[PDB]
Amino acid sequence: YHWHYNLPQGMERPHSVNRTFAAPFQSNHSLVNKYRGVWIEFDMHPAFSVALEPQLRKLPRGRTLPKTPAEEVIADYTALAPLVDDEKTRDLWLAKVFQHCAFQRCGGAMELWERYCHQRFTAEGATAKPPLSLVKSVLFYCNKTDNSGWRALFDRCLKDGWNYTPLFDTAQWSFMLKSIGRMGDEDGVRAVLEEMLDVQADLDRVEARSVVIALNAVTNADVYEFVKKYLFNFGERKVKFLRTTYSDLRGHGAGKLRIPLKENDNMYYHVCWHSSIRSPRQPNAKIDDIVKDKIEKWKAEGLLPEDY
Amino acid sequence: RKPQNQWEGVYYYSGITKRQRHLILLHRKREREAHMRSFNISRASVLQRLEQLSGDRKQESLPPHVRLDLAVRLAQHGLYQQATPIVDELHHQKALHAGHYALLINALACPRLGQRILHCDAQCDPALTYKLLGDENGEERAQEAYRWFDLALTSLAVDCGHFVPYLPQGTAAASHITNALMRTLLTCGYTHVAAIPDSVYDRMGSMGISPTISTYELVMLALSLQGNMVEAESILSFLRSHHSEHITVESFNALLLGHREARQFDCCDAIWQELVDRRWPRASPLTAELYLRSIMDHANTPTSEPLQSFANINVVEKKKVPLVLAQMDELGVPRTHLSRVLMDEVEDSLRKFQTYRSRFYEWGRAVKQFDFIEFRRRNGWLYDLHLMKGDIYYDDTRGLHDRSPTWMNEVPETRYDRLYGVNHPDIAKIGIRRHLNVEY
Amino acid sequence: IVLNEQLHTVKFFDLKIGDAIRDILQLLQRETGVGSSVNRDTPVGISPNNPERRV
Amino acid sequence: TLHNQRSAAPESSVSQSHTVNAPTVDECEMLAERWGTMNYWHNDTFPRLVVFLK
Amino acid sequence: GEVLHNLMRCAIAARHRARIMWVYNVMRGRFYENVVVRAEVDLIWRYRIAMIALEYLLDHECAEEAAAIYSYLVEEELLRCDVHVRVGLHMREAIAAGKPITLNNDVMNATSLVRDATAVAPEVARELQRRHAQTLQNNAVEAVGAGSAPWSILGPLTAIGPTAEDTMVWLQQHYGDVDVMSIMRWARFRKGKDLMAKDRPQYLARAAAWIELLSKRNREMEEVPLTYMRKSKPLVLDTNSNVRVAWQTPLMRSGGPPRLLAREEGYVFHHSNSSRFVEETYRHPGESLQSRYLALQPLHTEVSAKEDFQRLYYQAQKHHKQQE
Amino acid sequence: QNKFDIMRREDRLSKGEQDLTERNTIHYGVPIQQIVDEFVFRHRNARGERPLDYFKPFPNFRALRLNRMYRDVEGFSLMKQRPEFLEWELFTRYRQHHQQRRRLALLHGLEPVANETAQERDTRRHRLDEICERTPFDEREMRVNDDEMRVSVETLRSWFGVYMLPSPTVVNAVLGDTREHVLSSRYLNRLLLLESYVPHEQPQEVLRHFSAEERAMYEQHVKEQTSRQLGEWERAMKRRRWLTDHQQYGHVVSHGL
Amino acid sequence: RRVNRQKVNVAASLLDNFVEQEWTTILRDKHDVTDVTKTLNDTQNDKKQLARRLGRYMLFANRSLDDTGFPT
Amino acid sequence: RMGYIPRYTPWEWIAIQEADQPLIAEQIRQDNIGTSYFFSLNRYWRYKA
Amino acid sequence: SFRYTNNLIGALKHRLLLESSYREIASRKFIGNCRGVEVVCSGYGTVLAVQLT
């Protein structure tokens, strides 16, 4: 019951619980020092950076976003970029104005892709390979302005194409799924979510407001059954948070989004069913011959008479 | 209330996710591909440089310094067979000199192939690089290192043609080539690293060549790889007695490496604590790499006398890792100059044994304690070791009852209360009233 | 020698049946679904030894 | 039954700084560059100042 | 980058070598600050901080700390970056006018930094050969005790050819472990002052000291000749464990039989703080009272622990010269 | 896994040393304090191995431990496993003679040195012998112990003789009155002077399994070995030395006075 | 198998005795030849100078079965 | 024995209790620069003096 | 699963490198000298020329 005071007060047995169970760090709060954005990996040679320094000054650098309007940096790339004779310098410069026009939402920046980079990367079976910083910047741009040009570029990043999908970050897929749910591509949601499972991306650490938008745009019948088996891939902590965010984005907190959601209640009732499932509790030919033999018997018995 | 266990540790998060350990393994494979890609590009460039100067310069004889520059670059990339016809005609044309022979034998140890073996094959272990360089023609490069040493001493006798019976054995060039020979023979197999303290060292003594500090450090490194520590410390004891001004870091790097191979981890601690104490010569990042790897080999070593009745005992040696990393901040050793294989195991020991003052005020909260229990309850099959399955020396006749008055001091309240009826015939001796004797 | 190892397993008949029940108890407490994204080294739709593993 | 580790005698508790050993022949050569105590040059047995003078 | 630049400049004025390597260690960072936070120092500022740290440690001859920063510059490929900003400053002025710009080998060699580096390069190579010949001579006279030793007869440095191309040959085959052209461009300026155009022997002394510090091959060829450590075997009659039978080379004891290798008889490296080395014989027992009770007493003759070959060659030549 | 460590293993066992892969696990095997305690626990306080001072009311720390044979009995010649009624008391007096010599060496600086040469050792011993033969034996330091009897020097000189425990007139007569001085190393050195004055060889059942073609190369193998072993042995018994004046070996024929 | 293990032990020790017998013979007889090509400035290859640059003769009786042709 | 309770905790039981609990990083208390005479008492308000 | 295919990729990587290196051994010169005698040989063991430098 207790230990007496005249007994020797030795330790009875040691306990090694922290070395038998190695627990990873799990907090309900998010990380306060994370970038929460799409990184460009600006890796310019250190001779063009000081040469283009008045032009790169008005461009977004690491964790810095200048408020220069987008029509000036387009005009800087219109005139000065043919002067520099280097292929990867112009590609890294074009990735920055694609990032600058994304943060200011300028829809006219897709003309720069068709002017310079379309003919040598995405036209008529081009064998040249674009850098990773250019593909990340235009996919972040087309997802920000809800441009439909992401589909020709996302199909180029598969294993037979450029194979850049293992190099995409978890914040890249969050901005990707938000734009497809806003535009409403049912096969666009499935082709990305099949790619994220094939690439082994961090499915539990995608943005929860991005997943409930991409799941809200699921209306076709065959891709709706794809969502039912794909919803088991999330964690139990994630799938109970997808219910609370989807209920608030269609309820009181509908003003957090730029455009309102469309009412998809058959996805709403299934997510509320799937979140309650993961949470704890709190022969037609042979049968049709059977029935026809009985009606044949009942006319012989007289239970089904003729006209009187 | 039921008492809480005071010998049970606080539940805290010391571990990584299965995605993170996969992502560490995936990222470490990419840079092993990057060092494999970096070597074969430069190896193909020097082979294209060789065939260019052999094909288009077929009849035009090259200047001897261009052929000397290509011969050392072939030997550095592990291509020793493509360089021996170049050195045979340069010795025959008598264009090589005292410094040129020591340059070629030092190039024969291949310090470009060893860079690929370090990052990719040896898992950034500096002791394993000497063990793996001996397989890529270890005996073959050792014979050419002995042949180029005979080519060097023949050329030094011509170059020295008073001290005439003591030339060229007394010059600086004879020991420099002999130090170049021991450096090349260290990269060879075990048969040649054993010949460095016995056969090469006695041949240097029989030839009468005065050694330098780099002579003893390669002999100490040769005895370190054999595992003989009684002789390796004796050489530095000779250096501690006679030539103490010239002792550099590499003698300490041999002894940190040598006790790591002999698995005498108590000795390699005392060498590191000595180097922190004297602070001269300066601790290289090779010192911090060789000492921290000796900690991790001691930490992953299982014991067999308790036979791990409760847990692994040697994992407590990783608690010294925050002490050593704090010592590196004052010794001027940057912790960013550590290898990627070691830095993952260093940060493994840091998240297991290190906490800050801001975390220590919040690590014992009941929310974090009960999350540890539920995460052990939900998925304990993924992270568990059990779920995988007077003065006494002048006293001898003691003076008893020395009239020390206990009545000058006052301890009067020593009253004791005994149970009623001890000798009573009607009251039984045994009973449940005996439990009243333990009550205070 | 052979009788000592035969008598060593007959006294653990009762303790292994209780050990088998305790394996079922920790099995039903596992996280539902196919798993979590943080606790997997293998992708869900692919075999871990598949040659076309990394898309 | 025994141990597989390196068996070593404990380190000597004798003061090696105060014990003056026998003078070796290498000590006599660098005796002009040697720093010693007043007990070192005027030792009871083997005094080193007379070796510096001889 | 600008905050860590002033942190390094505070460490230069405070002369704190441990904090110079600390600011350099924070500048590289870990996986958390560079990938998770994405707060990393750019390549221009990482070149400036590492250069003023490498400038101080080479001026104050800190060999191990300067070797770590130079290992960072060869890893990050920042050896030719001082000319890259110089080309880029010219490319900024050229693109401001409207002319096209590019980066090749002929653009880098057309600058004033590389053209001045190759012109002074013969004077630096003569400074390296003059300084090494003085240190080789000082290693020989200190091995004897001041006459010269045979250590300074034939050194590891060859003669310099009489052209600028053989100068670049001689620097690449004797100091080829480091980039000698990048070092001489770094040592050109000192506190803003152009040493190459104003103080010519000061720059020649500064550039030769920086090449000799960063080169590992120069460190291995400028070593003081040490004495030869002899092996030892234990005694036949064990008197003490500190006295041992020493191994003597035939240069020390001439004549006698040709001996075998030392390890076969049992001669190993044995030395300690109280170790003594001796040659042991035994006193010859005659037809006397002592026949078998005694162990043939160990007559000893104390020998040295080292073989100073530079003094043995000097004294034998002194006997070859002062006798005649 | 590596050929370096495989060749290091077969080299180390050829030297007769510990293999490094045997040290891959750590054994802190059976410390001496545990073995003594389980020996006492098994033998019920280990009676008989305790001295009689353990059964006394006030024993010191040397009486509480078990009996061991220390390094005092290494020099006593007539010491047996069972002494005959007076040999232990002579041993305790001989031991006290060396402890006073150990005291006198520290008084006059005649303690041994760590790097002591044997030519310096015997001169230190000879200086210790001449300084201990003139100092009388202290009987106050000679303390009786556990079971031996207090016997004076007169009875020990009567039983074993005057040569065993000598007088100063005796030691000047041997190397060249009832009083005892400390023993010397040269006097007992004189007393003992006066009184003493083919690889891979196989058995026959393996040879029975051999064929006659394989026995022929077996007998050829042992032919070459014993010709090499006796050929090496005759070069040791010849003792023929190289004469440099004629550049030819030579052998001794006659031996004169 | 155990007697055939002794069959290769007596057959290797015949060969290990024969190799180092001639290896001492071609070294002791080349010691008295004294072929001097130091003025010729050759490539230092010879019959003796290739034999001494070869390593220690690892004896076949000391080898196991894996070094004599049997697979692991 | 029948009731042996040790009065000294064994070396195995000490090593288990030390290996389960982490160290505090501010216990090393090393200092080589000096005291910030102007800024250390006037830092940011959350972690201020 | 997929044990034959994953062993066949590693087997053909072993066969590709032994084929790439066999084309380099045969397309090379192997010159051996003993005493001024340049015996020039190819990778196939054929002596190309017995010269004397």
Short mmCIF file of N, CA, C and O in Angstrom, two decimals, chain F residues 68-124:
data_model
loop_
_atom_site.label_atom_id
_atom_site.label_comp_id
_atom_site.label_asym_id
_atom_site.label_seq_id
_atom_site.Cartn_x
_atom_site.Cartn_y
_atom_site.Cartn_z
N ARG F 68 45.13 -14.56 1.62
CA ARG F 68 45.77 -14.73 0.32
C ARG F 68 47.28 -14.81 0.52
O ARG F 68 47.81 -14.33 1.53
N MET F 69 47.95 -15.41 -0.45
CA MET F 69 49.41 -15.54 -0.43
C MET F 69 50.00 -14.36 -1.19
O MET F 69 49.90 -14.30 -2.42
N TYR F 70 50.61 -13.43 -0.47
CA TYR F 70 51.13 -12.21 -1.05
C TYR F 70 52.56 -12.44 -1.54
O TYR F 70 53.04 -13.58 -1.62
N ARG F 71 53.26 -11.36 -1.88
CA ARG F 71 54.58 -11.43 -2.48
C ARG F 71 55.70 -11.48 -1.44
O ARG F 71 56.86 -11.21 -1.77
N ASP F 72 55.38 -11.82 -0.18
CA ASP F 72 56.41 -11.97 0.84
C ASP F 72 57.03 -13.36 0.81
O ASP F 72 58.21 -13.52 1.14
N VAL F 73 56.26 -14.38 0.42
CA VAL F 73 56.73 -15.76 0.44
C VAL F 73 57.53 -16.15 -0.79
O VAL F 73 57.92 -17.32 -0.91
N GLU F 74 57.78 -15.22 -1.70
CA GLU F 74 58.45 -15.57 -2.96
C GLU F 74 59.94 -15.82 -2.77
O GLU F 74 60.55 -16.52 -3.58
N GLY F 75 60.54 -15.27 -1.72
CA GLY F 75 61.97 -15.36 -1.55
C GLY F 75 62.43 -16.38 -0.53
O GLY F 75 63.61 -16.76 -0.52
N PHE F 76 61.53 -16.83 0.33
CA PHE F 76 61.89 -17.76 1.40
C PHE F 76 62.11 -19.15 0.82
O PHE F 76 61.21 -19.72 0.20
N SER F 77 63.31 -19.69 1.02
CA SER F 77 63.69 -20.94 0.38
C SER F 77 63.07 -22.15 1.06
O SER F 77 62.48 -23.01 0.40
N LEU F 78 63.18 -22.23 2.39
CA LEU F 78 62.68 -23.39 3.13
C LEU F 78 61.20 -23.30 3.46
O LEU F 78 60.71 -24.13 4.24
N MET F 79 60.48 -22.32 2.91
CA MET F 79 59.05 -22.22 3.16
C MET F 79 58.30 -23.34 2.45
O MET F 79 58.41 -23.50 1.23
N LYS F 80 57.54 -24.11 3.22
CA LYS F 80 56.74 -25.20 2.71
C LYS F 80 55.26 -24.82 2.79
O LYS F 80 54.89 -23.77 3.31
N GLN F 81 54.42 -25.70 2.24
CA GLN F 81 52.98 -25.55 2.45
C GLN F 81 52.61 -25.79 3.91
O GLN F 81 51.70 -25.14 4.43
N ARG F 82 53.32 -26.69 4.58
CA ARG F 82 53.16 -26.93 6.01
C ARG F 82 54.48 -26.69 6.73
O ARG F 82 55.39 -27.53 6.65
N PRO F 83 54.64 -25.56 7.42
CA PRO F 83 55.87 -25.34 8.19
C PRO F 83 55.93 -26.23 9.42
O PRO F 83 54.91 -26.55 10.03
N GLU F 84 57.15 -26.62 9.79
CA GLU F 84 57.37 -27.55 10.89
C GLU F 84 57.80 -26.78 12.13
O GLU F 84 58.99 -26.68 12.46
N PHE F 85 56.81 -26.15 12.78
CA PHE F 85 56.80 -25.68 14.17
C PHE F 85 57.69 -24.46 14.43
O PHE F 85 57.48 -23.75 15.42
N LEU F 86 58.60 -24.13 13.52
CA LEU F 86 59.42 -22.94 13.71
C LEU F 86 59.75 -22.22 12.41
O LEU F 86 60.51 -21.25 12.46
N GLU F 87 59.24 -22.66 11.26
CA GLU F 87 59.62 -22.05 10.00
C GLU F 87 58.83 -20.79 9.70
O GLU F 87 59.31 -19.92 8.95
N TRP F 88 57.63 -20.66 10.26
CA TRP F 88 56.85 -19.45 10.04
C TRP F 88 57.39 -18.27 10.84
O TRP F 88 57.35 -17.13 10.37
N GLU F 89 57.91 -18.53 12.04
CA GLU F 89 58.45 -17.45 12.86
C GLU F 89 59.77 -16.94 12.31
O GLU F 89 60.10 -15.76 12.47
N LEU F 90 60.54 -17.81 11.65
CA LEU F 90 61.73 -17.36 10.93
C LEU F 90 61.34 -16.53 9.71
O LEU F 90 62.06 -15.58 9.35
N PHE F 91 60.21 -16.86 9.08
CA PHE F 91 59.74 -16.10 7.93
C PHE F 91 59.27 -14.71 8.33
O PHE F 91 59.49 -13.74 7.60
N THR F 92 58.62 -14.60 9.49
CA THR F 92 58.17 -13.29 9.96
C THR F 92 59.34 -12.43 10.42
O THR F 92 59.26 -11.20 10.35
N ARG F 93 60.42 -13.05 10.90
CA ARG F 93 61.60 -12.27 11.25
C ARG F 93 62.38 -11.87 10.01
O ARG F 93 62.95 -10.78 9.96
N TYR F 94 62.41 -12.74 9.00
CA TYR F 94 63.03 -12.39 7.72
C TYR F 94 62.26 -11.29 7.02
O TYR F 94 62.86 -10.43 6.36
N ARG F 95 60.93 -11.30 7.15
CA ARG F 95 60.11 -10.26 6.55
C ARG F 95 60.32 -8.92 7.25
O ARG F 95 60.34 -7.87 6.60
N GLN F 96 60.50 -8.95 8.57
CA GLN F 96 60.77 -7.72 9.31
C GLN F 96 62.17 -7.20 9.03
O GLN F 96 62.42 -5.99 9.14
N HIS F 97 63.10 -8.09 8.66
CA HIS F 97 64.44 -7.65 8.27
C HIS F 97 64.41 -6.86 6.98
O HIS F 97 65.15 -5.88 6.82
N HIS F 98 63.56 -7.25 6.03
CA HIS F 98 63.46 -6.52 4.77
C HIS F 98 62.70 -5.21 4.93
O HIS F 98 62.99 -4.25 4.21
N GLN F 99 61.73 -5.16 5.85
CA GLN F 99 60.99 -3.92 6.07
C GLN F 99 61.86 -2.86 6.73
O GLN F 99 61.66 -1.66 6.48
N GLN F 100 62.81 -3.26 7.57
CA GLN F 100 63.76 -2.30 8.11
C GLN F 100 64.77 -1.88 7.06
O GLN F 100 65.22 -0.73 7.06
N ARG F 101 65.13 -2.79 6.15
CA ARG F 101 65.97 -2.42 5.02
C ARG F 101 65.23 -1.50 4.06
O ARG F 101 65.81 -0.57 3.49
N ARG F 102 63.92 -1.74 3.89
CA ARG F 102 63.08 -0.81 3.13
C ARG F 102 63.00 0.55 3.81
O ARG F 102 62.91 1.58 3.13
N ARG F 103 63.02 0.57 5.14
CA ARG F 103 63.03 1.84 5.86
C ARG F 103 64.37 2.55 5.72
O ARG F 103 64.41 3.76 5.45
N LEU F 104 65.47 1.81 5.85
CA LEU F 104 66.80 2.41 5.82
C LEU F 104 67.17 2.93 4.43
O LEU F 104 67.97 3.86 4.31
N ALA F 105 66.61 2.33 3.37
CA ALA F 105 66.87 2.84 2.03
C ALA F 105 66.19 4.18 1.80
O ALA F 105 66.73 5.04 1.09
N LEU F 106 65.01 4.38 2.39
CA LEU F 106 64.33 5.67 2.28
C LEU F 106 64.95 6.73 3.18
O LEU F 106 64.78 7.92 2.91
N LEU F 107 65.64 6.32 4.25
CA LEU F 107 66.31 7.29 5.11
C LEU F 107 67.51 7.91 4.42
O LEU F 107 67.73 9.12 4.51
N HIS F 108 68.30 7.10 3.72
CA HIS F 108 69.56 7.54 3.14
C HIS F 108 69.52 7.60 1.62
O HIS F 108 70.57 7.62 0.97
N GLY F 109 68.32 7.65 1.04
CA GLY F 109 68.19 7.86 -0.39
C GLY F 109 68.56 6.68 -1.26
O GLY F 109 68.99 6.87 -2.40
N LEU F 110 68.42 5.45 -0.75
CA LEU F 110 68.80 4.25 -1.48
C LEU F 110 67.58 3.50 -2.02
O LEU F 110 67.65 2.28 -2.22
N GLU F 111 66.48 4.20 -2.25
CA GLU F 111 65.32 3.59 -2.88
C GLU F 111 65.58 3.36 -4.36
O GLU F 111 66.39 4.07 -4.97
N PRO F 112 64.95 2.36 -4.97
CA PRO F 112 65.17 2.12 -6.40
C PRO F 112 64.53 3.20 -7.27
O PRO F 112 63.66 3.96 -6.83
N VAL F 113 64.99 3.25 -8.52
CA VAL F 113 64.50 4.21 -9.49
C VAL F 113 63.76 3.46 -10.59
O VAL F 113 63.91 2.24 -10.74
N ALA F 114 62.95 4.19 -11.34
CA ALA F 114 62.17 3.58 -12.41
C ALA F 114 63.04 3.26 -13.63
O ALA F 114 62.88 2.20 -14.24
N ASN F 115 63.95 4.16 -13.98
CA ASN F 115 64.86 3.98 -15.11
C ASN F 115 66.22 3.49 -14.65
O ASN F 115 67.25 3.84 -15.23
N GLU F 116 66.24 2.68 -13.59
CA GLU F 116 67.48 2.29 -12.93
C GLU F 116 68.24 1.28 -13.78
O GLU F 116 67.74 0.20 -14.09
N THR F 117 69.47 1.64 -14.16
CA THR F 117 70.35 0.72 -14.86
C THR F 117 70.91 -0.30 -13.88
O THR F 117 71.05 -0.03 -12.69
N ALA F 118 71.21 -1.50 -14.41
CA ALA F 118 71.72 -2.57 -13.57
C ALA F 118 73.12 -2.29 -13.03
O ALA F 118 73.48 -2.83 -11.98
N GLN F 119 73.91 -1.47 -13.73
CA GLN F 119 75.18 -1.03 -13.17
C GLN F 119 74.98 0.00 -12.07
O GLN F 119 75.82 0.12 -11.17
N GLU F 120 73.90 0.77 -12.14
CA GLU F 120 73.53 1.66 -11.05
C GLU F 120 72.77 0.92 -9.95
O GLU F 120 72.71 1.42 -8.82
N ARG F 121 72.19 -0.24 -10.26
CA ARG F 121 71.37 -0.95 -9.29
C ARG F 121 72.23 -1.66 -8.24
O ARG F 121 71.96 -1.56 -7.04
N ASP F 122 73.25 -2.39 -8.69
CA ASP F 122 74.06 -3.17 -7.75
C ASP F 122 74.95 -2.29 -6.89
O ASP F 122 75.24 -2.64 -5.74
N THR F 123 75.39 -1.14 -7.42
CA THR F 123 76.13 -0.19 -6.59
C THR F 123 75.22 0.46 -5.56
O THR F 123 75.68 0.79 -4.46
N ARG F 124 73.95 0.66 -5.89
CA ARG F 124 72.98 1.08 -4.89
C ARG F 124 72.70 -0.03 -3.88
O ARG F 124 72.49 0.25 -2.70
#
